[PDB]
Design an enzyme around this catalytic site. Structure first.
Site, PDB file in Angstrom:
ATOM      1  N   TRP A   8     -23.471 -48.121  98.697  1.00 51.53           N
ATOM      2  CA  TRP A   8     -22.970 -46.754  98.875  1.00 51.53           C
ATOM      3  C   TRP A   8     -21.914 -46.710  99.968  1.00 51.53           C
ATOM      4  CZ3 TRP A   8     -23.306 -44.054  94.896  1.00 51.53           C
ATOM      5  CH2 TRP A   8     -24.418 -44.118  94.051  1.00 51.53           C
ATOM      6  N   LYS A  49     -32.581 -36.801  96.574  1.00 56.28           N
ATOM      7  CA  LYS A  49     -33.490 -37.920  96.916  1.00 56.28           C
ATOM      8  C   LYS A  49     -34.625 -37.429  97.776  1.00 56.28           C
ATOM      9  CE  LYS A  49     -30.353 -41.216  95.589  1.00 56.28           C
ATOM     10  NZ  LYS A  49     -28.956 -41.680  95.793  1.00 56.28           N
ATOM     11  N   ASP A  71     -23.360 -40.419 105.606  1.00 62.14           N
ATOM     12  CA  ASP A  71     -23.993 -40.218 104.305  1.00 62.14           C
ATOM     13  C   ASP A  71     -25.502 -40.396 104.501  1.00 62.14           C
ATOM     14  OD1 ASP A  71     -25.042 -40.302 101.746  1.00 62.14           O
ATOM     15  OD2 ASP A  71     -23.704 -41.935 101.042  1.00 62.14           O
TER      16      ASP A  71
HETATM   17  C1  LIG Z   1     -27.585 -41.758  95.318  1.00 66.02           C
HETATM   18  C2  LIG Z   1     -26.645 -41.937  96.536  1.00 66.02           C
HETATM   19  C3  LIG Z   1     -25.373 -41.429  96.448  1.00 66.02           C
HETATM   20  C4  LIG Z   1     -24.846 -40.816  95.134  1.00 66.02           C
HETATM   21  O1  LIG Z   1     -25.112 -39.423  95.064  1.00 66.02           O
HETATM   22  P1  LIG Z   1     -24.639 -38.549  93.798  1.00 66.02           P
HETATM   23  O2  LIG Z   1     -25.221 -37.226  94.045  1.00 66.02           O
HETATM   24  O3  LIG Z   1     -25.200 -39.290  92.656  1.00 66.02           O
HETATM   25  O4  LIG Z   1     -23.162 -38.604  93.906  1.00 66.02           O
HETATM   26  C5  LIG Z   1     -24.536 -41.532  97.524  1.00 66.02           C
HETATM   27  N1  LIG Z   1     -25.032 -42.027  98.706  1.00 66.02           N
HETATM   28  C6  LIG Z   1     -26.310 -42.505  98.811  1.00 66.02           C
HETATM   29  C7  LIG Z   1     -26.817 -43.137 100.109  1.00 66.02           C
HETATM   30  C8  LIG Z   1     -27.135 -42.442  97.721  1.00 66.02           C
HETATM   31  O5  LIG Z   1     -28.402 -42.949  97.865  1.00 66.02           O
HETATM   32 CL   LIG Z   2     -26.831 -49.205  99.565  1.00 69.91          CL
HETATM   33 CL   LIG Z   3     -29.390 -45.638  94.582  1.00 68.62          CL
END
Ligand SMILES: *Cc1c(COP(=O)(O)O)cnc(C)c1O
Ligand SMILES: [Cl-]
Ligand SMILES: [Cl-]
Ligand SMILES: *Cc1c(COP(=O)(O)O)cnc(C)c1O
Ligand SMILES: [Cl-]
Ligand SMILES: [Cl-]
Ligand SMILES: [Mg+2]
Ligand SMILES: [Mg+2]
Ligand SMILES: [Mg+2]
Ligand SMILES: [Mg+2]
Lengths: 360, 356
Positions: free
Chosen positions: A102, A196, A172
């Site tokens: 990511w 998540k 993030d």
């Molecule tokens: C799943 C994830 C993303 C992607 O998020 P979307 O909503 O699918 O764009 C980005 N950063 C992290 C750390 C993630 O775990």
């Molecule tokens: Cl990752």
């Molecule tokens: Cl993931």
């Protein structure tokens, strides 16, 4: 019926009371005789929900008054481009710390838009750890420094956050937001897709220092300016009302269990059950992360070869476990243990792991 | 406890779709998880995702050379994504202005490239759709953009222009799948779901594949989503689930022709009421351009307007206040608004007129 254990990595388990609450009022919300999905986002019933989700977040993470909370569509992925679109101006550098896949996706989008730098990276050793903050290469013309707090695919996590004073620190936090206390004022901006650890897919939480980003950026499409959403309190165009509602409900649940501090205690306990199982397996299970970087949210491991990996995962699926396959890009296994995953699921997984090992 | 949902966006949904959602909210498809708790890469989700696309393809009879995308960001993000992808240098984003949503789309294009107004009824406060013979088109048009139903003004295209020099592009947010469509007339169609198709949070994009790119952000390229079947990142899974449910309801009642019959009866009830009111209620749209989706009207003065809307609200009607930009009244009668609600509205309108 039979047991189901939900280790999905995103979207993921929700706390039952948030779902039971939604189910009970799905057709008649707040006595309006309408679903919250059927309301105007300008209605007082919706505005209450929208404001409450913000206030719960504020209280739970103790967000300072000079920060605003945005609810945006587009996922974290859209934030990968929106951030450099707003802050990566000419002559400046988008500086990234790479600690997994990511992080690389974020960097890639800034590369489309400006000068980038890599402050530090554990990519060479396959992202098994968080680099030492002393190794951070910083630049005077950095627009920001960007990190990934929890590396969802690799199973590693920041234990603490760097003190940065030359540029805003951006994070993030998609897979560990509100899994523990946070000193929000360490950051210029934090973002997280909600699916998540905060609720449903379809909304992205963005906590932003208002003065870093409440100003118009020339040449940026209206929907892609933070300023737009700050000014309109995330009501510029139609919001994802049911997602924000469910986010509210999930936040209420976190508050009800004692907040970030209490949920961190629960999350450390669940994580310990799995890592102790790995650690007492005499190498039958091998965790990807180095011990000082182990994530509390996503536990990544392998068996000794791919055949055993596959037999283990097939047995799990037959016993009711969902989502244990590692991300497609890396293989192995991944137990996602976000806030709402119950501890007895973790105990169940331990039992699976021990009998599989003993019977192998 | 009588409530009549004339909300203009988000809006009424079919009771069977909401009841179905309620029933399986905790245990979708015997998985013992909510649809909201599934991985978007699970087969369980993937079947729902595909089923929503399949139902739209069937119901609108979308040809094979079109792809159906489910995106986030609303129709508003489409306003900029479209020129971002198609408004290349030396080309022109050509707009037909038939209301304020038309204006909002044209504004985003002006950020990114050369624009043009093919035709506009703005001078006359958008009381009608312009005559197609009036369009001013350009050899180098990148597209011609229209708004099929002008949500705030209450006017709607009766039919669509035959455009061959460039793709015809349509913001159908407030009338998509309210009647049969000839999708082959268009290069692209887009709509937030939240008026006729589902709850807010998902945008449906129907795009001629071969129609649609160096330097555009990954998430903002149509090609990204076409290539990944709108599973490039995490889609709005619950909104797509609910969209499927709404589409099943439309299919169950007889499809696009059947829902058009219902919709024409709903609009007939209100317009007849207005026309038979001897000038007590006055419609904004010229007759020939009257929308079947948003009926806009006013009373003879502002104080009567206000008395009416107050009386409406007390009687359980929701959403009838006109858009702030135009005032008056607006009765939004999207697919799921039942005929019984429009009858109730009529009866209120008639009683109010009698008692004034
Ligand atoms: C799943 C994830 C993303 C992607 O998020 P979307 O909503 O699918 O764009 C980005 N950063 C992290 C750390 C993630 O775990
Ligand atoms: Cl990752
Ligand atoms: Cl993931
Ligand atoms: C409501 C509407 C929009 C705005 O949609 P969002 O999903 O709020 O961006 C755009 N165009 C038309 C015709 C609309 O009625
Ligand atoms: Cl309009
Ligand atoms: Cl509107
Ligand atoms: Mg509480
Ligand atoms: Mg239990
Ligand atoms: Mg059916
Ligand atoms: Mg008649």
């Amino acid at each position: 019926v039979k047991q189901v254990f939900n280790f999905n990595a995103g979207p993921s388990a929700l706390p039952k009371p948030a779902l039971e609450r939604a189910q009970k009022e799905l057709l008649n919300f707040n006595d309006t005789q309408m679903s919250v999905m059927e309301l105007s986002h300008r209605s007082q019933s919706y505005e209450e929900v929208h404001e409450q989700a913000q206030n719960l977040l504020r209280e739970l993470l103790q967000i300072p008054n000079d920060y605003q909370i945005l609810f945006l569509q587009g996922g974290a992925s859209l934030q990968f481009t929106m951030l450099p679109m707003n802050l990566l101006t000419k002559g400046t550098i988008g500086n990234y710390v790479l600690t997994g896949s990511w992080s690389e996706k974020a960097l890639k989008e800034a590369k489309l838009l400006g000068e980038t730098h890599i402050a530090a990276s554990t990519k060479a050793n396959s992202y098994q750890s968080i680099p030492d903050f002393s190794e951070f290469q910083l630049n005077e013309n950095d627009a920001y420094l960007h990190i990934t707090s929890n590396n969802t695919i690799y199973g590693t996590q920041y234990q603490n956050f760097p003190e940065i004073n030359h540029a805003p620190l951006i994070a993030d936090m998609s897979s560990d937001i509100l899994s523990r206390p946070l000193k929000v004022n360490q950051f210029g901006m934090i973002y997280a897709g909600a699916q998540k650890n905060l609720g449903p897919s379809g909304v992205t939480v963005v906590i932003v220092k208002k003065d870093l980003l409440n100003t118009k950026v020339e040449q940026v499409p209206t929907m892609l300016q933070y300023a737009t959403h700050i000014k309109s309190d995330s009501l510029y165009n139609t919001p994802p009302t049911f997602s924000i509602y469910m986010l509210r409900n999930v936040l209420d649940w976190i508050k009800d269990l004692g907040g970030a501090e209490a949920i961190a205690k629960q999350n450390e306990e669940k994580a310990k059950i799995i890592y102790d199982t790995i650690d007492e397996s005499n190498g039958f299970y091998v965790g990807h992360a180095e011990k000082g970087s182990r994530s509390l949210m996503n536990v990544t491991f392998n068996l000794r070869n791919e055949e055993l990996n596959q037999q283990f995962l097939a047995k799990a699926k037959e016993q009711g476990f969902v989502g244990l396959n590692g991300h497609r890009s890396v293989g192995g296994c991944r137990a996602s243990i976000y806030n709402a995953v119950p501890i007895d699921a973790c105990i169940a997984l331990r039992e699976l792991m021990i009998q599989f090992k003993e019977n192998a």
